[PDB]
Amino acid sequence: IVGGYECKPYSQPHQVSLNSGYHFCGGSLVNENWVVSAAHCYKSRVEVRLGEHNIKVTEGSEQFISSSRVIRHPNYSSYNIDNDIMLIKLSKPATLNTYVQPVALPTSCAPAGTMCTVSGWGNTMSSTADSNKLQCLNIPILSYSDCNNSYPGMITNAMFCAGYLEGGKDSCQGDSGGPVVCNGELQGVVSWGYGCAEPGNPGVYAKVCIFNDWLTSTMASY
């Protein structure tokens, strides 16, 4: 997260770290058994680490749980990173407590101008902000006009832009799969951009509100 601040510990209790030897993507807990992340973060087995604030230190709040199933959206397209959403089923349920709580799925799509929070352990591009401690950033959803103007003809219905066209504040490598939460609902999943925090290149996010049918049917398919 570039241009953000260290989150109050456990203020984002749905945030998880996906780990296969090192942190490489984030995710969000949506109930005891399932995590939402980005399809390009797919690995056949991942360890999900919950209740984290500083990922390089054991703090006593953590739960490390192996995945039993990792399910990409059937229509994910790696060429253009379209339908970039994935479900991860935990091999055992998470214990919900002060450190670990699920985030609600969206009741409807959030309109442009809504202020949201994005968080993660990715690159901060700063000697002052430590990426091992969870970073937080408040970003507004941008209009489709602004989003398509920044990335001509690259924005599909499964995508939205959020951030600041002036640059300086953005998500970045290592934040993929993590949450964009707006008024208590998961509206986006960190997905792609050109560089990080560059002027005219805001972050692009998977649009969770058009996937509620696939997410809720798959979370009860097996």
Binding site: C25, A38, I81, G122, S176, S191, Y194, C196
Partner: peptide, 29 residues
């Protein structure tokens, strides 16, 4: 260029996804 925000170690550009390149620091971006 279109570059997903995953943390991925690399040596050369071809190790990276989409239009990400392997930046000097040994990671895609």
């Amino acid at each position: 260029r279109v570059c997903p925000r995953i943390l991925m170690e690399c040596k050369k550009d071809s190790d990276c996804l989409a239009e990400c390149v392997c930046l000097e620091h040994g990671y895609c971006g």
